[PDB]
Amino acid sequence: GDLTLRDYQMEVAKPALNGENIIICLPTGSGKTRVAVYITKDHLDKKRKASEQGKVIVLVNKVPLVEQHLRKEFNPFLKHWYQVIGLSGDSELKISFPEVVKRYDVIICTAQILENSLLNATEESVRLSDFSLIIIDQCHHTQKEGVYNNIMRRYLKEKIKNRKQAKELIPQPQILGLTASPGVGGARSNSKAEEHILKICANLDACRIMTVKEHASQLKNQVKEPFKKTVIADDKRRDPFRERIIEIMQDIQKYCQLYPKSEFGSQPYEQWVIREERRAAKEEKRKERVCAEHLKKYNDALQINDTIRMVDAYNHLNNFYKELKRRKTAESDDDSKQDETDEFLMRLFHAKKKQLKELARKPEYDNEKLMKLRNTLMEEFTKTEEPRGIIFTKTRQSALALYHWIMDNPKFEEVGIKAHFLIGAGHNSETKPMTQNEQREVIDKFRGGSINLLIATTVAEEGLDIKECNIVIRYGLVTNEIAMVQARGRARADESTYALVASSGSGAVEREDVNIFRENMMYKAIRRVQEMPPEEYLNKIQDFQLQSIVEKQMKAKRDQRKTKNPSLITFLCKNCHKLICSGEDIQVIENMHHVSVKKDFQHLYHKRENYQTNVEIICKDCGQVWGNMMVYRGLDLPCLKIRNFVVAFEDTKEIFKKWGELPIIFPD
RNA sequence: GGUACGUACC
RNA sequence: GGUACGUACC
Ligand SMILES: Nc1ncnc2c1ncn2[C@@H]1O[C@H](COP(=O)(O)OP(=O)(O)O)[C@@H](O)[C@H]1O
Ligand SMILES: [Mg+2]
Ligand SMILES: [Zn+2]
């Protein structure tokens, strides 16, 4: 069942029920989406009784939230009274969006489905005037160049144009923002915190920002905060894995004569060594670029030794050199690759390989954070009958490696822990992705009980419905104040704890403290804009709105300048600098995957196993990855990744990470 | 592929 | 603005 609100929910709803644009700030577990449904039904029922056209769009930022808001909230209470539909880019609908607007009263979709129609591109459109109410889920993203903010910039442009036609009357939707924390925008001062709150208010055209105050006690009974802990590890353990890896890196640096201005295993080392790899490739210095590539792989092993067990560090290097054997070795079905440097670096590893493998088997040198994590898990999974937990970590590799650490250790299995990792769907990582369906099944098994502990990246912090946790561990991960409150929001079972496990040397404890500081500033700043007199608030809101419109015009003029011709360019291999393609030889498939056409192109490469296929293309002369094969219309075609080539010009040699960075448009 | 946001380091 | 890690949308 029956559509009602709690008193704290009604308190924040009241102005939206009277037709005012507002932002609603309700904590995690407060039922913000239930408030959205009550306001949707109320809004539509009033439009019926006034014989008027009622229409609502609910905008979300993740695809699963479309289906989730339908099932749990929107269909149960509205389906029998109004036409309701959930829509996404993933679902190939046979109806166009403009028709979906004509047929349905409540549209729940991802924001880019609306923007695609407002833009058109391919050209009677949809406009924001078609909708009488627009609800934005997770409205703290209504910021900068986000899709939310682009939708709302059209709304403000239509608001200003409306006053021009009064003096010489196009209808404007009501707007409702829903969030748990609008944020502080990286501010370190209360002034800049209050500036950020007003900017978000300005972007959503809010009459007022809305929080629970009269029924604050009721809200505190509904959602109980977890107990906070900070488990620090000083790491005064001797670290012979770090020491011997550094000796290998030092040896390599003397060979190539590349010397850093920065500590081993640190972030500026990683920047330097990647810069040095790029430079050496441009300048045809195979010795330097190959060494810098390996040095990076050793620099990875140091920083994963810092966060996870040193066996995973071993495996990172061990797998790299396994793949190096495969590419450099002349196999059958092929129509020397091994340089001096290649031979030097391979033997260096094999020599010092024995020690590292067997040093890695001794857990006494195996990372103090892991014991602190172990101890925290043991004491918490023995605390309750049917517990559930999440470990938040920085890298995908770290998520998978922690899963193996939990599995390759029978005392966690003994005490009832049944772990599984959880990572992103994107394909920009050097680790492989989980698909959206695999993500869904893991989260479903977590609610079932089949799975007990998630080792998650930031995938698990916002939006998605996850079962109430007894423990949330931030394992070395400290991002922003919004993510912090969202992570703390997952721990909402009876007797739940939120814990930061980190090295004192990482500076993550100090960054957690500024995010606590920022969170406190946020509440003071919300309080200040609520107490601000209307005339003062209105003027500041108008300023931010006007200068936000100007902000898009500037970025429009930036992107206009860079707006080629092929055959200007050749393609050299980054490792060995052999001539391979001209610019005329390249053609594109569905304007995304680039392919070579040259008639005698097969002679310049070999095929190896390890998106279309799982067959790599590698350089004949040197074994450098160029990309992979693909099947298109029954033709075996070579897909070349731009990362792998030095691109020469006629007038200059440069390396690009994306095909779009080249100032050249290619054929179909 | 394209784009966006978050964080760290320059 | 750059590099990397992470996430997402089309
Ligand atoms: N006024 C209400 N009456 C009954 N149940 C409610 C009410 N508000 C919320 N709920 C229930 O609580 C749940 C909301 O939890 P959740 O989705 O975690 O909230 P939020 O999205 O704010 O974090 C829903 O399953 C809903 O059925
Ligand atoms: Mg909800
Ligand atoms: Zn080559």
Which tokens go with A141?
A: 């993203």
CA A312 to chain centre: 24
Q: Are residues A38 and A173 in the same domain?
A: yes
| Strand C nucleotides within 7 Å of a protein CB | 2-10
CA A56 to chain centre: 29
Experimental method: X-ray
Q: Are residues A200 and A266 in the same domain?
A: no
Give the integer Cα–Cα distance in Å for A624 and A323.
11
Give the integer Cα–Cα distance in Å for A361 and A311.
7
Beta bridge partners of residue A87, listed in sequence order: A109
Element housing A589 (H / E) = strand A586-589
Angle between helix A286-307 and A267-282 (nearest 10): 160
Query: What is the A564 CA–ligand 3 centroid distance (Å)?
Result: 27
Q: Are residues A247 and A190 in the same domain?
A: no
Ligand 1 contact via A262 beta carbon (within 6 Å): no
Q: Are residues A209 and A347 in the same domain?
A: no
Is residue A268's beta carbon less than 7 angstroms from any atom in nucleic acid strand B?
A: yes
Give the integer Cα–Cα distance in Å for A457 and A394.
6
Is residue A429's beta carbon less than 7 angstroms from any atom in nucleic acid strand C?
A: yes
Output the domain CATH number for residue A590. 2.170.150.30
Q: Are residues A147 and A280 in the same domain?
A: no
Q: Which residue has the tokens 């080792």?
A: A455
Exposure of A236 by Cβ count < 10 A (0-12 exposed, 13-18 middle, 19+ buried)? exposed
Radius of gyration of chain A (CA): 29
Q: Confirm whether residue A230 is marked as ligand binding.
A: no
Task: State the Cα angle at A297 between A291 and A298, rounded to 5°.
Answer: 85
Is residue A141's beta carbon less than 7 angstroms from any atom in nucleic acid strand B?
A: yes
Residue A3 backbone phi and psi in degrees, to 5: -75, 95
The 3-state DSSP class for residue A84 equals strand
Which tokens go with A503?
A: 């090295």
**Exposure b/e, A162-182, CB count within 10 A at least 16 = b:** eeeeeeeeeebbbbbbbbbbb
| Strand B nucleotides within 7 Å of a protein CB | 1-10
Which one, of A467, A463, A275, A248, lies nearest residue A348 by Cα?
A248
Query: What is the A625 CA–ligand 3 centroid distance (Å)?
Result: 8
Q: Are residues A592 and A545 in the same domain?
A: no
Closest nucleotide C1' to the C-alpha of A558: C1
Closest nucleotide C1' to the C-alpha of A140: B5
The 3-state DSSP class for residue A466 equals coil
Which one, of A180, A305, A203, A301, lies nearest residue A252 by Cα?
A301
Q: Tell me which of A6, A8, A34, A468 to substitute to probe ligand 1's pocket, judged by most ligand atoms within 8 Å of the beta carbon.
A: A34
Which one, of A343, A456, A303, lies nearest residue A391 by Cα?
A456
How far lies A95's CA from each of A22, A98, A419, A463, in Å? 32, 8, 42, 28
How far lies A570's CA from each of A126, A576, A652, A654, A660, in Å? 45, 15, 11, 11, 16
Q: Are residues A249 and A150 in the same domain?
A: no
The boundaries of the domain holding residue A165 are: 7-222+531-553
Output the domain CATH number for residue A356. 1.20.1320.30
Exposure of A131 by Cβ count < 10 A (0-12 exposed, 13-18 middle, 19+ buried)? buried
Q: Are residues A101 and A202 in the same domain?
A: yes
Q: Are residues A17 and A149 in the same domain?
A: yes
Q: How many CB atoms lie within 10 A of CB A266?
A: 15
Q: Are residues A195 and A311 in the same domain?
A: no
Q: Are residues A207 and A300 in the same domain?
A: no
> Roughly how many angstroms between the first and final C-alpha of chain A, as a whole number?
56
Q: Are residues A246 and A152 in the same domain?
A: no
| Beta-carbon neighbours within 5 Å of ion ligand 2 | A 33
Output the domain CATH number for residue A96. 3.40.50.300
**DSSP per residue over A342-356, as a string?**
HHHHHHHHHHHHHHH
